């Protein structure tokens, strides 16, 4: 019930002012366009996927590469890091998701599983644990797989459009996905049915990510308007838009406390908003192309951004 607005509720709160984040790292070594990323729970190891058929696992602290996997196919657009750091996954338009095991053989790498059978492209694939994984298929359905068995252990139906993105709750029991129907849908990963659906958008939901408390999420549209939604509200809580530039949003993610919400546009920049007062808290610039994904460490010390420029940037 939109009896008021968040700005009215947070009126008595002063803005954080101009947020100034610095560049701590410049991860070079990628040969082609980067399409995804995921932090490990140790905030030290991260996974990056690029169209050169490569999945590279980098150590954030020491700037050096720890692992490099040559993929079967060059159309990867999503990758996820296992919370325990034992597994990685990749996949894309090939309707096949390849999963590799890390702490079984070191130095080299093994393709522990290949998930084939999808009728739609993989737009996002996400770990839940060392044995479960959720993949986004553009056939208006998603799929929950068990890596050890390789089957579509569950199918997610209810969307009427090509699913672009998803994100798990911080506790990895619930995930919200957006499709071409300009609507977002909340799902229980074990139950997989469309509980709440959010409409009103003019284009596909090109970005979606969860709030650290697992009670709210964000959406990105083509008209440069980032939107904040609550799980239970079934309506948008804040709109963060600029009229002068018409490029869409690509990725979203929140700060550890959630005072700060990050969202990148095709205008070569990312904007970080004071989530409380819709204030344009700061701008992150430096990517040599459009931003493709970004994330925050589970402990919240630093943010990583991966873009089409083939370089990852870490900000503190």
């Amino acid at each position: 019930c939109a009896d008021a607005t968040l700005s009215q509720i947070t009126n008595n709160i002063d803005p954080v002012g101009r947020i100034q984040m610095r560049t701590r790292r410049t991860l070079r070594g990628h040969l082609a366009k980067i399409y995804a990323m995921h932090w490990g729970t140790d905030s030290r190891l991260l996974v990056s996927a690029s169209q050169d058929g490569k999945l590279i696992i980098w150590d954030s602290y020491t700037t050096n590469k720890v692992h490099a996997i040559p993929l079967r196919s060059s159309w990867v657009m999503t990758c996820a890091y296992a919370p325990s750091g034992n597994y990685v996954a990749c996949g894309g338009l090939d309707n096949i998701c390849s999963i590799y095991n890390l702490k079984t053989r070191e130095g080299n790498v093994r393709v522990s599983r290949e998930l084939a059978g999808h009728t739609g492209y993989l737009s996002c694939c996400r770990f839940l644990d060392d044995n479960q994984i959720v993949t986004s298929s553009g056939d208006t359905t998603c799929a929950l797989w068990d890596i050890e068995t390789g089957q579509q252990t569950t199918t997610f139906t209810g969307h009427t459009g090509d699913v672009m993105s998803l994100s798990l709750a911080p506790d990895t029991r619930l995930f919200v996905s957006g499709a071409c129907d300009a609507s977002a849908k909340l799902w229980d990963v074990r139950e997989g049915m469309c509980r709440q659906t959010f409409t009103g958008h003019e284009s596909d939901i090109n970005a979606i990510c969860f709030f650290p408390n697992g009670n709210a999420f964000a959406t990105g549209s083509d008209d440069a308007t980032c939107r904040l939604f609550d799980l239970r509200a079934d309506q948008e809580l804040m709109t963060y838009s600029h009229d002068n530039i018409i490029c869409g949003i690509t990725s979203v993610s929140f700060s550890k406390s959630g005072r700060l919400l990050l969202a990148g546009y095709d205008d070569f920049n990312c904007n970080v908003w004071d989530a409380l007062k819709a204030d344009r808290a700061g701008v992150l610039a430096g990517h040599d192309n459009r931003v493709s994904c970004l994330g925050v460490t589970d402990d919240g010390m630093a943010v990583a951004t991966g873009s089409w420029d083939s370089f990852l940037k870490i900000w503190n």
Partner: antibody
Amino acid sequence: VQLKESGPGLVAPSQSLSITCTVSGFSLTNYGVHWVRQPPGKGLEWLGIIWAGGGTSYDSALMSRLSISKDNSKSQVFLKMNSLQSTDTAMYYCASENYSYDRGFAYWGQGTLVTVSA
Amino acid sequence: DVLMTQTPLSLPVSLGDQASISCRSSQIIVNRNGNTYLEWYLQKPGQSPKLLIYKVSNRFSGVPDRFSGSGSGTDFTLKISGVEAEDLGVYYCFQGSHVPWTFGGGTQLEIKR
């Protein structure tokens, strides 16, 4: 830095008032703009502020009837105030906020008297 | 809901004399980042207010040095070193720490003859 205001001198009661305080000498995306009205022969009253990034803070009494919006490209900030009353007869001032001076309103608008009468 | 109560309410001051205008809020005010915002505005009759002291004690560019800004905690004071013809008007102390921000009640400074 100069703030110049323009608005309708006479407005009918309960209608919508559109006041423009076109700013100059600074980037509107980095400074706040204030609204203060002064009834004839009385002390000042506080209305609200839009912050540098577009966030808004209003007087606790006047969130519902006051609206502050801006076009950053044109250096134009617009006050939309609805449900006007006779008590709204006042010299409405737009005041700048400078972060570098830490909440000091260096520059105030010249003010335009607005009359709510038949 | 802090209120700036200003004293003295109306004090006749001769030319060249020094005058003390102190205002104390209904509650102790400090910004959450550690700053305190007391600003003194001189308003001529019917004109827009003009800032004199920003950040409690710092004079703004163009503000005459004959105005002395100081004070701490709940006590703040603007002192005038030499009173000229341009000293006529009303003086308000302003707080910018807790919203909704509030102005002082205004001090009627008058010139004797």
